[PDB]
Amino acid sequence: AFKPGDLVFAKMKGYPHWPARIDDPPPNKYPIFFFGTHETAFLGPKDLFPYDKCKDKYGKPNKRKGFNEGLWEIQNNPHASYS
Amino acid sequence: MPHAFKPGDLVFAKMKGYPHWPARIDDIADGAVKPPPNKYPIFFFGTHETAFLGPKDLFPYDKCKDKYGKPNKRKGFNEGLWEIQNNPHASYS
Amino acid sequence: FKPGDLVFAKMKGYPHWPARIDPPNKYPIFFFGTHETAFLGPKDLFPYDKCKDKYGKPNKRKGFNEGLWEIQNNPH
């Protein structure tokens, strides 16, 4: 399963696969923290892609607000308090 | 003295082929598409459309309302006039 | 959508724009009139024959009306 601190790209409708982590929720959903925007959501595993596996496909800069900062955070300090 | 443009500033915005149009400097939601360098996201009242414009096309509302703040035949213009005067900071989406 | 398919393509800050099909689940888009290219997802794309009644109307934006002429008369 996914555990708190696992790094992912998380997919929501209308947005690119977004650098995120599992934070420490409805059944079979996880608390997601989105890097860059510092937003939260509850997502299921269908929308959760392991970071290391998928970073070559999903980890490329784009024009969305918060995305490029999100990429910096997941690479450089993924476990910090962003609150 | 004037500052640079910021989200929430009210303007008349000038697009080619259109009258100076009531508008605001929009905010950019988290996750949303950012403007190009030196451009602002402009939300046009009435039509509710967004374009990216530089300051050459942006006329401060308080200064220019006497000149441009007048009914126009164009689709959405008069609704735009109501919005800029009465609820310019509201959610229109 | 397939290479050559005619569409209206929507980018933030622009009207629905005559274009053709030429980064995960993005299509290469060629915009008529301006002759620029972008990558766009299927959500931003609208089949030309299906939606021309709606979006095939003149616009004062630079290159748009030239774009409309190309999509109807010389799309390839």
Author numbering:
A (entry chain B): 4 to 27, 35 to 93
B (entry chain A): 1 to 93
C (entry chain C): 5 to 26, 36 to 89
Q: How is this structure described in the published paper?
A:
The PWWP domain comprises 100–130 amine acids and is often present in chromatin-associated proteins. Our structures revealed that the overall fold of the PWWP domain consists of three motifs: a canonical β-barrel core, an insertion motif between the second and third β-strands and a C-terminal α-helix bundle. The canonical β-barrel core harbors an aromatic cage constructed by three aromatic residues, which is a signature feature of the Tudor domain “Royal family”. Taken together, similar to other members in the ‘Royal family’, PWWP domain also exhibits methyllysine histone binding ability.
HDGF (hepatoma-derived growth factor) and the HRPs (HDGF-related proteins) consist of a highly conserved PWWP domain in their N-terminus and a variable region in the C-terminus. HDGF2 binds H3K36me3, H3K79me3 and H4K20me3 weakly. To shed light on the molecular mechanism of methylated histone binding by PWWP domains, we determined the crystal structures of the PWWP domain of human BRPF1 in complex with H3K36me3 and that of human HDGF2 in complex with H3K79me3 and H4K20me3. We were also able to co-crystallize HDGF2 with both H3K79me3 and H4K20me3 peptides, which show very similar binding mode. In all these complex structures, the methyllysine binding aromatic residues are from the loop between the first and second β-strands, the N-terminus of the second β-strand and the C-terminus of the third β-strand. The histone residues C-terminal to the modified lysine do not make significant contributions to the binding, reminiscent of HP1 and Polycomb chromodomains, which mainly binds H3K9me3 and H3K27me3 peptides through residues N-terminal to the respective target lysines. In these complex structures, the insertion motif is directly involved in histone binding, forming one side of the histone binding groove.
